[PDB]
């Protein structure tokens, strides 16, 4: 009676644990991957991250400048 | 038979018939470095959320 009215079967807890373990394992591997990706982008600068501004080339004036040699 | 130019005539911008080829690279510039990959795609929710310590969202 106690088992019937207060508790559930073992399969429920077993499969809930399986799902929880999957979630945590993927989170751990994602954390490692993100750390490595951040390190690579900060070192190489070719990624979307750690992009530091440079001078906009639309500011340059391309006209004759009173002297032939610029 | 020389007629003296009027005011503001010698300051005109005029065109020149020349057979000298146009210099293709007058600045002697190198090759510009390749741009960043400029990734594009469709956004999806973050995998398991923020994944910051114990937070599940
Ligand atoms: C003080 C508190 C006063 C009352 C506050 C009520 C809400 C309290 C929420 C606190 C946490 C907020 C949060 O970020 O939750 C995300 C998450 C819970 O989200 P979830 O329940 O998995 O959400 C699943 C779905 O969104 C599905 O979510 P759901 O369907 O279970 O949500 C139902 C909804 C029910 O809505 C209502 O009841 C509305 C009327 C009330 O939730 C609530 O309102 C009750 C909570 O909690 C955490 O990530 C860990 C939080 C750990 C504590 C906070 C960090 C500091 C702790 C140490 C300091 C001392 C703490 C004591
Ligand atoms: C001879 C008898 C021998 C056995 C004695 C049994 C004693 C029972 C009292 C002790 C209870 C222990 C604590 C249990 C708390 C948790 C129970 C909880 O899990 O059950 C919930 C229900 O909680 C109960 O309603 C709590 C009862 C609280 C009262 C206990 C008895 C004493 C109450 C005294 C009140 C006095 C008031 C003043 C009177 C004048 C519903 O559970 P649920 O999450 O759905 O479960 C899912 C699985 N299902 C679907 C199979 C169930």
Tab-separated table of N, CA and C and ligand atoms in Angstrom:
chain	number	residue	atom	x	y	z
A	1	UNK	N	0.822	-1.204	0.000
A	1	UNK	CA	0.000	0.000	0.000
A	1	UNK	C	0.859	1.258	0.000
A	2	UNK	N	1.919	1.278	0.811
A	2	UNK	CA	2.801	2.442	0.867
A	2	UNK	C	3.445	2.685	-0.492
A	3	UNK	N	3.938	1.618	-1.125
A	3	UNK	CA	4.539	1.754	-2.446
A	3	UNK	C	3.519	2.229	-3.472
A	4	UNK	N	2.286	1.729	-3.386
A	4	UNK	CA	1.268	2.086	-4.366
A	4	UNK	C	0.837	3.540	-4.227
A	5	UNK	N	0.729	4.041	-2.998
A	5	UNK	CA	0.155	5.368	-2.805
A	5	UNK	C	1.192	6.482	-2.714
A	6	UNK	N	2.423	6.197	-2.293
A	6	UNK	CA	3.389	7.264	-2.066
A	6	UNK	C	4.527	7.307	-3.071
A	7	UNK	N	4.827	6.208	-3.751
A	7	UNK	CA	6.035	6.107	-4.556
A	7	UNK	C	5.712	5.614	-5.962
A	8	UNK	N	6.742	5.614	-6.807
A	8	UNK	CA	6.641	5.152	-8.184
A	8	UNK	C	7.625	4.012	-8.415
A	9	UNK	N	7.692	3.504	-9.638
A	9	UNK	CA	8.560	2.390	-9.945
A	9	UNK	C	10.000	2.810	-10.121
A	10	UNK	N	10.881	1.811	-10.231
A	10	UNK	CA	12.311	2.107	-10.410
A	10	UNK	C	12.653	2.662	-11.780
A	11	UNK	N	11.879	2.315	-12.811
A	11	UNK	CA	12.169	2.773	-14.166
A	11	UNK	C	12.142	4.290	-14.252
A	12	UNK	N	11.219	4.915	-13.526
A	12	UNK	CA	11.093	6.366	-13.545
A	12	UNK	C	12.386	7.041	-13.111
A	13	UNK	N	12.901	6.665	-11.937
A	13	UNK	CA	14.135	7.257	-11.434
A	13	UNK	C	15.324	6.873	-12.303
A	14	UNK	N	15.344	5.634	-12.796
A	14	UNK	CA	16.432	5.179	-13.656
A	14	UNK	C	16.548	6.046	-14.905
A	15	UNK	N	15.435	6.241	-15.610
A	15	UNK	CA	15.478	6.981	-16.863
A	15	UNK	C	15.598	8.483	-16.636
A	16	UNK	N	15.062	8.996	-15.525
A	16	UNK	CA	15.319	10.386	-15.173
A	16	UNK	C	16.802	10.620	-14.927
A	17	UNK	N	17.463	9.685	-14.239
A	17	UNK	CA	18.901	9.789	-14.037
A	17	UNK	C	19.644	9.736	-15.363
A	18	UNK	N	19.193	8.879	-16.280
A	18	UNK	CA	19.824	8.809	-17.594
A	18	UNK	C	19.742	10.151	-18.318
A	19	UNK	N	18.562	10.777	-18.300
A	19	UNK	CA	18.398	12.072	-18.961
A	19	UNK	C	19.248	13.153	-18.299
A	20	UNK	N	19.272	13.173	-16.966
A	20	UNK	CA	20.073	14.154	-16.238
A	20	UNK	C	21.549	13.988	-16.570
A	21	UNK	N	22.022	12.740	-16.603
A	21	UNK	CA	23.420	12.479	-16.911
A	21	UNK	C	23.762	12.925	-18.322
A	22	UNK	N	22.863	12.683	-19.282
A	22	UNK	CA	23.113	13.182	-20.630
A	22	UNK	C	23.257	14.695	-20.635
A	23	UNK	N	22.323	15.399	-19.993
A	23	UNK	CA	22.357	16.861	-20.005
A	23	UNK	C	23.671	17.366	-19.423
A	24	UNK	N	24.078	16.801	-18.286
A	24	UNK	CA	25.292	17.273	-17.628
A	24	UNK	C	26.541	16.948	-18.441
A	25	UNK	N	26.581	15.775	-19.078
A	25	UNK	CA	27.743	15.425	-19.889
A	25	UNK	C	27.884	16.354	-21.090
A	26	UNK	N	26.773	16.644	-21.777
A	26	UNK	CA	26.851	17.584	-22.893
A	26	UNK	C	27.246	18.975	-22.423
A	27	UNK	N	26.748	19.407	-21.263
A	27	UNK	CA	27.155	20.711	-20.750
A	27	UNK	C	28.652	20.755	-20.467
A	28	UNK	N	29.203	19.684	-19.893
A	28	UNK	CA	30.635	19.654	-19.602
A	28	UNK	C	31.466	19.718	-20.881
A	29	UNK	N	31.110	18.902	-21.876
A	29	UNK	CA	31.892	18.913	-23.108
A	29	UNK	C	31.753	20.241	-23.843
A	30	UNK	N	30.577	20.871	-23.772
A	30	UNK	CA	30.408	22.197	-24.354
A	30	UNK	C	31.268	23.234	-23.643
A	31	UNK	N	31.388	23.138	-22.318
A	31	UNK	CA	32.235	24.078	-21.593
A	31	UNK	C	33.695	23.949	-22.012
A	32	UNK	N	34.195	22.715	-22.124
A	32	UNK	CA	35.571	22.530	-22.587
A	32	UNK	C	35.756	23.086	-23.996
A	33	UNK	N	34.811	22.777	-24.889
A	33	UNK	CA	34.909	23.239	-26.266
A	33	UNK	C	34.908	24.761	-26.339
A	34	UNK	N	34.055	25.410	-25.545
A	34	UNK	CA	33.982	26.866	-25.562
A	34	UNK	C	35.268	27.490	-25.046
A	35	UNK	N	35.861	26.911	-23.999
A	35	UNK	CA	37.140	27.430	-23.521
A	35	UNK	C	38.210	27.343	-24.606
A	36	UNK	N	38.287	26.201	-25.296
A	36	UNK	CA	39.286	26.056	-26.353
A	36	UNK	C	39.028	27.021	-27.506
A	37	UNK	N	37.762	27.196	-27.883
A	37	UNK	CA	37.415	28.105	-28.971
A	37	UNK	C	37.783	29.539	-28.612
A	38	UNK	N	37.503	29.948	-27.373
A	38	UNK	CA	37.869	31.287	-26.927
A	38	UNK	C	39.373	31.487	-26.991
A	39	UNK	N	40.135	30.485	-26.548
A	39	UNK	CA	41.588	30.596	-26.608
A	39	UNK	C	42.071	30.751	-28.046
A	40	UNK	N	41.508	29.962	-28.962
A	40	UNK	CA	41.931	30.032	-30.356
A	40	UNK	C	41.588	31.381	-30.979
A	41	UNK	N	40.382	31.896	-30.717
A	41	UNK	CA	40.016	33.193	-31.280
A	41	UNK	C	40.857	34.321	-30.701
A	42	UNK	N	41.172	34.266	-29.408
A	42	UNK	CA	41.974	35.337	-28.828
A	42	UNK	C	43.405	35.287	-29.343
A	43	UNK	N	43.922	34.084	-29.606
A	43	UNK	CA	45.283	33.974	-30.119
A	43	UNK	C	45.369	34.398	-31.580
A	44	UNK	N	44.426	33.949	-32.409
A	44	UNK	CA	44.607	34.092	-33.850
A	44	UNK	C	43.862	35.300	-34.405
A	45	UNK	N	42.742	35.673	-33.795
A	45	UNK	CA	42.008	36.838	-34.235
A	45	UNK	C	41.197	36.657	-35.497
A	46	UNK	N	41.024	35.423	-35.972
A	46	UNK	CA	40.325	35.202	-37.234
A	46	UNK	C	38.840	34.931	-37.016
A	47	UNK	N	38.408	34.834	-35.765
A	47	UNK	CA	37.031	34.534	-35.461
A	47	UNK	C	36.177	35.772	-35.292
A	48	UNK	N	34.875	35.576	-35.071
A	48	UNK	CA	34.006	36.727	-34.773
A	48	UNK	C	34.328	37.414	-33.458
A	49	UNK	N	34.999	36.728	-32.538
A	49	UNK	CA	35.268	37.310	-31.233
A	49	UNK	C	36.626	37.999	-31.211
A	50	UNK	N	36.799	38.868	-30.217
A	50	UNK	CA	38.041	39.608	-30.007
A	50	UNK	C	38.421	40.415	-31.243
A	51	UNK	N	37.416	40.983	-31.902
A	51	UNK	CA	37.628	41.816	-33.076
A	51	UNK	C	37.791	43.262	-32.629
A	52	UNK	N	39.000	43.784	-32.754
A	52	UNK	CA	39.298	45.124	-32.297
A	52	UNK	C	39.288	46.086	-33.469
A	53	UNK	N	38.736	47.285	-33.299
A	53	UNK	CA	38.536	48.174	-34.446
A	53	UNK	C	39.848	48.631	-35.068
A	54	UNK	N	39.811	48.824	-36.380
A	54	UNK	CA	40.857	49.484	-37.140
A	54	UNK	C	40.237	50.651	-37.899
A	55	UNK	N	41.095	51.494	-38.472
A	55	UNK	CA	40.626	52.719	-39.112
A	55	UNK	C	39.750	52.378	-40.308
A	56	UNK	N	38.603	53.042	-40.400
A	56	UNK	CA	37.709	52.862	-41.534
A	56	UNK	C	38.322	53.478	-42.786
A	57	UNK	N	38.378	52.699	-43.862
A	57	UNK	CA	38.992	53.161	-45.098
A	57	UNK	C	38.070	54.052	-45.919
A	58	UNK	N	36.818	54.225	-45.498
A	58	UNK	CA	35.921	55.167	-46.149
A	58	UNK	C	36.227	56.613	-45.785
A	59	UNK	N	37.079	56.845	-44.786
A	59	UNK	CA	37.476	58.197	-44.422
A	59	UNK	C	38.540	58.769	-45.345
A	60	UNK	N	39.249	57.923	-46.090
A	60	UNK	CA	40.361	58.389	-46.907
A	60	UNK	C	39.835	59.193	-48.086
A	61	UNK	N	40.478	60.326	-48.354
A	61	UNK	CA	40.138	61.181	-49.481
A	61	UNK	C	41.009	60.817	-50.677
A	62	UNK	N	40.369	60.500	-51.799
A	62	UNK	CA	41.055	60.110	-53.028
A	62	UNK	C	40.815	61.208	-54.060
A	63	UNK	N	41.649	62.237	-54.020
A	63	UNK	CA	41.525	63.380	-54.909
A	63	UNK	C	42.917	63.913	-55.191
A	64	UNK	N	43.090	64.680	-56.264
A	64	UNK	CA	44.357	65.395	-56.451
A	64	UNK	C	44.625	66.334	-55.282
A	65	UNK	N	45.876	66.351	-54.826
A	65	UNK	CA	46.246	66.952	-53.548
A	65	UNK	C	47.263	68.075	-53.707
A	66	UNK	N	47.111	68.904	-54.738
A	66	UNK	CA	47.908	70.117	-54.934
A	66	UNK	C	49.381	69.811	-55.185
A	67	UNK	N	49.773	68.545	-55.037
A	67	UNK	CA	51.127	68.088	-55.288
A	67	UNK	C	50.969	66.710	-55.917
A	68	UNK	N	51.690	66.423	-57.000
A	68	UNK	CA	51.449	65.168	-57.728
A	68	UNK	C	51.729	63.915	-56.920
A	69	UNK	N	52.646	63.973	-55.956
A	69	UNK	CA	53.121	62.792	-55.248
A	69	UNK	C	52.358	62.543	-53.954
A	70	UNK	N	51.068	62.878	-53.931
A	70	UNK	CA	50.227	62.823	-52.732
A	70	UNK	C	50.714	63.816	-51.690
B	1	UNK	N	48.250	86.996	-83.822
B	1	UNK	CA	46.857	86.629	-83.623
B	1	UNK	C	46.573	85.959	-82.297
B	2	UNK	N	47.181	86.446	-81.221
B	2	UNK	CA	47.016	85.854	-79.901
B	2	UNK	C	45.949	86.620	-79.134
B	3	UNK	N	44.902	85.917	-78.712
B	3	UNK	CA	43.826	86.499	-77.920
B	3	UNK	C	44.050	86.124	-76.463
B	4	UNK	N	44.138	87.129	-75.605
B	4	UNK	CA	44.428	86.899	-74.194
B	4	UNK	C	43.244	86.208	-73.525
B	5	UNK	N	43.470	85.123	-72.785
B	5	UNK	CA	42.353	84.422	-72.142
B	5	UNK	C	41.634	85.297	-71.127
B	6	UNK	N	40.336	85.049	-70.987
B	6	UNK	CA	39.488	85.827	-70.099
B	6	UNK	C	39.651	85.356	-68.657
B	7	UNK	N	38.898	85.982	-67.757
B	7	UNK	CA	38.984	85.648	-66.343
B	7	UNK	C	38.391	84.268	-66.088
B	8	UNK	N	39.133	83.436	-65.363
B	8	UNK	CA	38.656	82.119	-65.001
B	8	UNK	C	38.751	81.071	-66.081
B	9	UNK	N	39.437	81.358	-67.185
B	9	UNK	CA	39.572	80.383	-68.258
B	9	UNK	C	40.764	79.458	-68.052
B	10	UNK	N	41.907	79.994	-67.624
B	10	UNK	CA	43.075	79.154	-67.403
B	10	UNK	C	42.957	78.296	-66.151
B	11	UNK	N	41.947	78.528	-65.317
B	11	UNK	CA	41.680	77.684	-64.162
B	11	UNK	C	40.672	76.583	-64.456
B	12	UNK	N	40.218	76.459	-65.697
B	12	UNK	CA	39.313	75.379	-66.059
B	12	UNK	C	40.012	74.032	-65.950
B	13	UNK	N	39.229	73.003	-65.648
B	13	UNK	CA	39.695	71.625	-65.720
B	13	UNK	C	39.423	71.137	-67.137
B	14	UNK	N	40.477	70.748	-67.845
B	14	UNK	CA	40.380	70.353	-69.241
B	14	UNK	C	40.780	68.893	-69.416
B	15	UNK	N	40.437	68.343	-70.576
B	15	UNK	CA	40.748	66.962	-70.909
B	15	UNK	C	41.954	66.896	-71.837
B	16	UNK	N	42.676	65.781	-71.766
B	16	UNK	CA	43.931	65.595	-72.482
B	16	UNK	C	43.853	64.309	-73.293
B	17	UNK	N	44.208	64.395	-74.574
B	17	UNK	CA	44.357	63.222	-75.437
B	17	UNK	C	45.777	62.697	-75.275
B	18	UNK	N	45.919	61.542	-74.631
B	18	UNK	CA	47.223	60.934	-74.423
B	18	UNK	C	47.174	59.456	-74.781
B	19	UNK	N	48.288	58.959	-75.312
B	19	UNK	CA	48.458	57.542	-75.598
B	19	UNK	C	49.278	56.830	-74.534
B	20	UNK	N	49.697	57.539	-73.497
B	20	UNK	CA	50.400	56.909	-72.395
B	20	UNK	C	49.441	55.999	-71.636
B	21	UNK	N	49.800	54.741	-71.397
B	21	UNK	CA	48.885	53.837	-70.694
B	21	UNK	C	48.636	54.284	-69.265
B	22	UNK	N	47.429	54.014	-68.793
B	22	UNK	CA	47.067	54.340	-67.421
B	22	UNK	C	47.807	53.416	-66.465
B	23	UNK	N	48.547	53.941	-65.490
B	23	UNK	CA	49.250	53.061	-64.547
B	23	UNK	C	48.261	52.265	-63.709
B	24	UNK	N	48.377	50.937	-63.779
B	24	UNK	CA	47.383	50.082	-63.139
B	24	UNK	C	47.578	50.017	-61.627
B	25	UNK	N	48.817	50.130	-61.155
B	25	UNK	CA	49.130	50.114	-59.726
B	25	UNK	C	50.108	51.240	-59.413
B	26	UNK	N	49.638	52.490	-59.414
B	26	UNK	CA	50.559	53.613	-59.171
B	26	UNK	C	51.122	53.643	-57.762
B	27	UNK	N	50.444	53.024	-56.803
B	27	UNK	CA	50.875	53.014	-55.413
B	27	UNK	C	51.808	51.861	-55.083
B	28	UNK	N	52.012	50.932	-56.018
B	28	UNK	CA	52.830	49.741	-55.793
B	28	UNK	C	52.339	48.968	-54.573
B	29	UNK	N	51.020	48.881	-54.437
B	29	UNK	CA	50.414	48.220	-53.291
B	29	UNK	C	50.598	46.711	-53.373
B	30	UNK	N	50.642	46.078	-52.206
B	30	UNK	CA	50.684	44.626	-52.119
B	30	UNK	C	49.269	44.078	-52.291
B	31	UNK	N	49.090	42.790	-52.016
B	31	UNK	CA	47.759	42.206	-51.997
B	31	UNK	C	47.137	42.414	-50.624
B	32	UNK	N	45.872	42.819	-50.603
B	32	UNK	CA	45.189	43.008	-49.334
B	32	UNK	C	44.947	41.657	-48.666
B	33	UNK	N	45.138	41.561	-47.351
B	33	UNK	CA	44.861	40.298	-46.660
B	33	UNK	C	43.395	39.911	-46.767
B	34	UNK	N	43.150	38.605	-46.749
B	34	UNK	CA	41.800	38.095	-46.934
B	34	UNK	C	40.912	38.497	-45.760
B	35	UNK	N	39.641	38.799	-46.004
B	35	UNK	CA	38.748	39.193	-44.910
B	35	UNK	C	38.364	38.005	-44.040
B	36	UNK	N	37.732	38.325	-42.915
B	36	UNK	CA	37.263	37.309	-41.992
B	36	UNK	C	36.073	36.558	-42.588
B	37	UNK	N	35.821	35.329	-42.126
B	37	UNK	CA	34.828	34.471	-42.796
B	37	UNK	C	33.408	35.023	-42.841
B	38	UNK	N	33.072	36.040	-42.046
B	38	UNK	CA	31.741	36.665	-42.015
B	38	UNK	C	30.628	35.614	-42.025
B	39	UNK	N	30.613	34.806	-40.969
B	39	UNK	CA	29.703	33.671	-40.908
B	39	UNK	C	28.251	34.130	-40.908
B	40	UNK	N	27.396	33.340	-41.556
B	40	UNK	CA	25.971	33.613	-41.621
B	40	UNK	C	25.204	32.315	-41.423
B	41	UNK	N	24.026	32.432	-40.824
B	41	UNK	CA	23.209	31.272	-40.529
B	41	UNK	C	21.971	31.680	-39.755
B	42	UNK	N	21.232	30.670	-39.309
B	42	UNK	CA	19.978	30.867	-38.595
B	42	UNK	C	20.187	30.607	-37.108
B	43	UNK	N	19.771	31.562	-36.277
B	43	UNK	CA	19.956	31.434	-34.837
B	43	UNK	C	19.077	30.340	-34.251
B	44	UNK	N	19.633	29.626	-33.286
B	44	UNK	CA	18.961	28.600	-32.508
B	44	UNK	C	19.186	28.900	-31.037
B	45	UNK	N	18.312	28.414	-30.158
B	45	UNK	CA	18.516	28.641	-28.723
B	45	UNK	C	19.825	28.033	-28.244
B	46	UNK	N	20.399	28.644	-27.211
B	46	UNK	CA	21.642	28.143	-26.645
B	46	UNK	C	21.454	26.727	-26.118
B	47	UNK	N	22.477	25.899	-26.299
B	47	UNK	CA	22.395	24.506	-25.882
B	47	UNK	C	22.431	24.409	-24.364
B	48	UNK	N	21.320	23.953	-23.781
B	48	UNK	CA	21.162	23.836	-22.329
B	48	UNK	C	21.292	25.193	-21.640
B	49	UNK	N	20.991	26.257	-22.380
B	49	UNK	CA	20.950	27.584	-21.800
B	49	UNK	C	22.324	28.197	-21.589
B	50	UNK	N	22.437	28.964	-20.503
B	50	UNK	CA	23.676	29.675	-20.208
B	50	UNK	C	24.807	28.717	-19.872
B	51	UNK	N	24.479	27.583	-19.249
B	51	UNK	CA	25.465	26.618	-18.763
B	51	UNK	C	26.447	27.254	-17.788
B	52	UNK	N	25.975	28.196	-16.982
B	52	UNK	CA	26.805	28.863	-15.989
B	52	UNK	C	26.553	28.206	-14.640
B	53	UNK	N	27.521	27.412	-14.183
B	53	UNK	CA	27.484	26.752	-12.875
B	53	UNK	C	26.208	25.928	-12.769
B	54	UNK	N	25.322	26.204	-11.817
B	54	UNK	CA	24.170	25.366	-11.520
B	54	UNK	C	22.894	25.815	-12.217
B	55	UNK	N	22.928	26.906	-12.973
B	55	UNK	CA	21.717	27.434	-13.585
B	55	UNK	C	21.281	26.551	-14.744
B	56	UNK	N	20.012	26.152	-14.732
B	56	UNK	CA	19.461	25.285	-15.764
B	56	UNK	C	18.858	26.054	-16.930
B	57	UNK	N	18.765	27.374	-16.831
B	57	UNK	CA	18.247	28.190	-17.919
B	57	UNK	C	19.311	29.172	-18.393
C	1	LIG	C1	12.749	34.250	-2.640
C	1	LIG	C2	11.846	33.550	-3.649
C	1	LIG	C3	10.439	34.130	-3.617
C	1	LIG	C4	9.553	33.456	-4.657
C	1	LIG	C5	10.256	33.409	-6.007
C	1	LIG	C6	9.537	32.470	-6.966
C	1	LIG	C7	10.492	32.007	-8.057
C	1	LIG	C8	11.836	31.637	-7.444
C	1	LIG	C9	12.855	31.284	-8.519
C	1	LIG	C10	14.273	31.388	-7.975
C	1	LIG	C11	15.279	30.960	-9.034
C	1	LIG	C12	15.075	31.746	-10.323
C	1	LIG	C13	15.750	31.008	-11.452
C	1	LIG	O1	16.685	31.505	-12.051
C	1	LIG	O2	15.289	29.683	-11.828
C	1	LIG	C14	15.989	28.938	-12.819
C	1	LIG	C15	16.199	27.518	-12.309
C	1	LIG	C16	14.860	26.808	-12.159
C	1	LIG	O3	14.242	26.667	-13.435
C	1	LIG	P1	13.331	25.377	-13.747
C	1	LIG	O4	12.349	25.207	-12.613
C	1	LIG	O5	14.245	24.236	-14.119
C	1	LIG	O6	12.512	25.830	-15.057
C	1	LIG	C17	12.065	24.860	-16.003
C	1	LIG	C18	11.097	25.477	-17.011
C	1	LIG	O7	11.385	26.866	-17.206
C	1	LIG	C19	9.661	25.307	-16.528
C	1	LIG	O8	9.450	26.044	-15.327
C	1	LIG	P2	8.191	25.707	-14.382
C	1	LIG	O9	7.012	25.361	-15.257
C	1	LIG	O10	8.653	24.736	-13.324
C	1	LIG	O11	7.888	27.117	-13.668
C	1	LIG	C20	6.674	27.306	-12.944
C	1	LIG	C21	6.646	28.713	-12.365
C	1	LIG	C22	5.354	28.880	-11.572
C	1	LIG	O12	4.870	30.210	-11.740
C	1	LIG	C23	4.069	30.837	-10.703
C	1	LIG	O13	3.827	30.219	-9.681
C	1	LIG	C24	3.548	32.241	-10.890
C	1	LIG	C25	2.930	32.722	-9.585
C	1	LIG	C26	3.931	32.619	-8.440
C	1	LIG	O14	7.789	28.874	-11.524
C	1	LIG	C27	7.544	29.613	-10.294
C	1	LIG	O15	6.951	30.676	-10.338
C	1	LIG	C28	8.023	29.065	-8.971
C	1	LIG	C29	9.541	29.170	-8.901
C	1	LIG	O16	16.845	27.561	-11.037
C	1	LIG	C30	18.296	27.483	-11.124
C	1	LIG	O17	18.834	27.500	-12.218
C	1	LIG	C31	19.124	27.372	-9.866
C	1	LIG	C32	18.717	28.453	-8.871
C	1	LIG	C33	19.497	28.311	-7.568
C	1	LIG	C34	19.179	29.445	-6.600
C	1	LIG	C35	19.516	30.800	-7.211
C	1	LIG	C36	20.992	31.143	-7.041
C	1	LIG	C37	21.292	31.647	-5.634
C	1	LIG	C38	20.960	30.593	-4.586
C	1	LIG	C39	21.658	30.905	-3.267
C	1	LIG	C40	21.037	32.114	-2.578
C	1	LIG	C41	19.885	31.700	-1.671
C	1	LIG	C42	18.806	30.957	-2.448
C	1	LIG	C43	17.645	30.576	-1.539
C	2	LIG	C1	-1.285	1.067	9.954
C	2	LIG	C2	-0.716	2.163	9.079
C	2	LIG	C3	0.766	1.934	8.805
C	2	LIG	C4	1.308	2.981	7.841
C	2	LIG	C5	1.239	4.373	8.456
C	2	LIG	C6	1.255	5.445	7.374
C	2	LIG	C7	1.448	6.827	7.984
C	2	LIG	C8	1.219	7.919	6.947
C	2	LIG	C9	1.671	9.269	7.488
C	2	LIG	C10	3.177	9.439	7.336
C	2	LIG	C11	3.519	10.003	5.962
C	2	LIG	C12	5.028	10.121	5.787
C	2	LIG	C13	5.388	11.364	4.982
C	2	LIG	C14	4.978	11.243	3.520
C	2	LIG	C15	5.174	12.582	2.821
C	2	LIG	C16	5.335	12.424	1.314
C	2	LIG	C17	4.145	11.694	0.709
C	2	LIG	C18	3.847	12.223	-0.687
C	2	LIG	O1	4.847	11.758	-1.597
C	2	LIG	O2	2.571	11.743	-1.099
C	2	LIG	C19	1.769	12.790	-1.639
C	2	LIG	C20	0.487	12.884	-0.819
C	2	LIG	O3	0.837	13.418	0.456
C	2	LIG	C21	-0.046	13.034	1.506
C	2	LIG	O4	-1.349	13.571	1.260
C	2	LIG	C22	0.493	13.601	2.815
C	2	LIG	C23	-0.325	13.143	4.015
C	2	LIG	C24	-0.036	14.025	5.226
C	2	LIG	C25	-0.754	13.515	6.469
C	2	LIG	C26	-0.086	12.255	7.004
C	2	LIG	C27	-0.901	11.628	8.130
C	2	LIG	C28	-0.930	12.513	9.370
C	2	LIG	C29	-1.749	13.776	9.138
C	2	LIG	C30	-2.132	14.421	10.464
C	2	LIG	C31	-3.077	15.597	10.252
C	2	LIG	C32	-3.724	16.025	11.564
C	2	LIG	C33	-4.584	17.267	11.362
C	2	LIG	C34	-5.313	17.652	12.644
C	2	LIG	C35	-6.334	16.589	13.035
C	2	LIG	C36	-7.130	17.023	14.247
C	2	LIG	C37	1.467	12.510	-3.106
C	2	LIG	O5	2.636	11.977	-3.727
C	2	LIG	P1	2.856	12.062	-5.318
C	2	LIG	O6	3.972	13.039	-5.598
C	2	LIG	O7	1.510	12.228	-5.980
C	2	LIG	O8	3.386	10.578	-5.645
C	2	LIG	C38	3.471	10.108	-6.987
C	2	LIG	C39	3.371	8.587	-6.995
C	2	LIG	N1	1.967	8.186	-6.826
C	2	LIG	C40	1.166	8.747	-7.921
C	2	LIG	C41	1.870	6.722	-6.853
C	2	LIG	C42	1.459	8.684	-5.543
